[PDB]
């Protein structure tokens, strides 16, 4: 075969014992990982969230940094590979997907058999209640706390955060973003386009559910900023350092009060679980949250440019096998999380070229978009592989 230009997919099987069957036409660019596919049901309206099909609906399109991926090499060779994927869901549901491909020049003919079982009859999969877009519902007190955090960034008090002000705060916390990085962070959340991050835009950014970044990740990263010496406790001096560097001036008395308020077990330091509880005496709790929200805002702004991108980690147990893993915390209509993990085993008919076995692990970042009716899916994928 040659490198791919066009592909087709027959994806079929059952979810909770209900049969589905879709047939699909697409294209992509093997030089950059791009794919697009149109799928239509042959068996009327889908009875489950098509979001669980998104990873399943063609790594022959994925290049590596300096040449072909092994997937591509196996297509060009003709000998090819087989794919076995399992997904485990937090409700105990499981899905298995097996693929076959055939190649005719630049054309891939793919078939994927999907069997999934154990989905709660009223959960988000069986009720089509998974979405790309949701936000937190904030109370007035939560909005008031975000406004305190916003004020740490708004150094001149003019009611908006500039690149100068965001850079100042990030630098105070040991991060050195470039001006272009600061402009990208702002433009990603700057709804009115003025070049600054105002309080409504700040609130909206903090309330957004990001596809591949959840509360646990943000609170874990925030703890890391406080816990400067990485010993798993925030001490009084570490708390003082974060507060001072953010611009929140505190007396020795106040630092002591904040530690005592958080320090449930009485050892004079704040462990990760005590921190989690603070981030979920009212004036001490509000001061912790002012700093915590500010730290989380920096983490969220820092990470926006890959917000739409999910990482897979690939290794080779031997010269004819790749094992890939990722995790996906789907978002529900009501802005809750629905966690899954995936494990995919690729079996190659011929041994992979030696340089693939040398360059382990590989990390592959994927962006996906799904537009769906009851009968039709429009899918796009963007991919990038890193050593
Ligand atoms: Ca300002
Ligand atoms: Ca703005
Ligand atoms: Ca520490
Ligand atoms: Ca403690």
Numbering used by the authors: 11 to 67, 71 to 293, 301 to 407
Anything the authors wrote about it?
Herein, we report the engineering of a series of the brightest green GECIs developed by the insertion of the CaM/M13-peptide Ca2+-binding domain into the mNeonGreen fluorescent protein. This indicator was named NCaMP7 and was characterized by a 1.8-fold higher molecular brightness as compared to the brightness of the mEGFP protein, which makes NCaMP7 the brightest green calcium indicator among all GECIs reported to date. The NCaMP7 indicator demonstrated a positive fluorescence response to Ca2+ ions, with a high dynamic range (ΔF/F of 27) and high affinity to calcium ions of 125 nM in vitro. The overall structure of the NCaMP7 consists of two linked domains—the mNeonGreen fluorescent domain and the CaM/M13-peptide Ca2+-binding domain.
We successfully crystallized the NCaMP7 indicator in the Ca2+-bound state and determined its spatial structure at 1.75 Å resolution. There is one NCaMP7 molecule in the asymmetric unit, and contact analysis revealed that the protein has a monomeric state in the crystal. The mNeonGreen domain has a typical β-barrel fold with the chromophore formed by 68GYG70 amino acids and positioned on the central helix of the barrel. Therefore, the EF hands in NCaMP7 have a canonical structure consisting of two short α-helices connected by a loop region, which, together with a single water molecule, provide seven ligands coordinating a single Ca2+ ion in a pentagonal bi-pyramidal coordination sphere. Hence, the N200I and T217A mutations in NCaMP7 may affect the positions of amino acids in the EF2 hand and in the first linker between the fluorescent and Ca2+-binding domains.
